[PDB]
Design a protein around this ligand. Structure first.
Ligand SMILES: C/C=C/C[C@H](C(C)=O)n1cc([C@@](C)(NC(=O)c2ccccc2)C(C)C)nn1
Length: 218
């Protein structure tokens, strides 16, 4: 029943690619990206949400360390606990750790729950991407080839299932006989294909893409 390919950009559910700079905030970008799609699905409005709000506010209580890393799932829980997250416009990204400056007057989204998908199951990830929306994932992005990706479907024999980088699966498909996951990164539009990378799909949980998937709901 699932479509052979999905691209949530086609449905206007994906915001512009962001640039995290020298702050290890990929986790926060991944989390807001997933929530941005849900916000569009629920309200019809596409709005960039504040990764900085997560960096500054979803901190020790959530096991997160701001520019030194965090979890997408615990970011979602912060949004639930906090009863909101501010817009990116209201609480802009500065690529540094700041005091928490959340203000409900700038709230642009809420979250009521999140779901973690079973480990390594690319079929379940496919179903979620098709039926729920973009899914936050971790990948192994440590390998020099990752940084140099320009086009095609990324396959790195040295990749592992030990994830170190938080990104957003916004689709899937097949290109020239290679199944892929369409991944939104947060290293700006210079990276890959305008900020995206197509990563090998159904190749044994390549780079751990299906290791730790999660998605929020509004
Ligand atoms: C040590 C710096 C990590 C930066 C960085 C990034 C890709 O920007 N990063 C990796 C992570 C990952 C691997 N999480 C963690 O590394 C992490 C770190 C501290 C506390 C909690 C978690 C997530 C993707 C799960 N979070 N941020």
């Amino acid at each position: 029943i699932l479509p052979d390919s999905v691209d949530w950009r086609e449905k206007g559910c994906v915001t512009e690619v962001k640039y995290q700079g020298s702050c290890g905030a990929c986790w926060a970008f991944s989390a807001v990206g997933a929530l941005e799609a849900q916000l569009k699905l629920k309200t019809g409005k596409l709005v960039s949400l504040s990764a900085q709000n997560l960096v500054d506010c979803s901190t020790e209580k959530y096991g997160n360390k701001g520019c030194n890393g965090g979890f997408m799932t615990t970011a979602f829980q912060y949004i639930i606990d906090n009863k909101g997250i501010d817009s990116d416009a209201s609480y802009p990204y500065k690529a540094m750790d700041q005091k928490c400056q959340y203000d409900s007057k700038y709230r642009a989204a809420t979250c009521s729950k999140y779901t973690e998908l079973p480990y390594g199951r690319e079929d379940v990830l496919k179903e979620a991407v098709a039926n729920k929306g973009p899914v936050s994932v971790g990948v192994d992005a440590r390998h020099p080839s990752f940084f140099l990706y320009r086009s095609g479907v990324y396959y790195e024999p040295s990749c592992t299932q030990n994830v170190n980088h938080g990104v957003l699966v916004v689709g899937y498909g097949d290109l020239n006989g290679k199944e892929y996951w369409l991944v939104k990164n947060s290293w700006g539009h210079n990276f890959g294909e305008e900020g995206y990378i197509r990563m090998a799909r159904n190749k044994g949980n390549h780079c751990g893409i299906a290791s730790f998937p999660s998605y929020p709901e509004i």
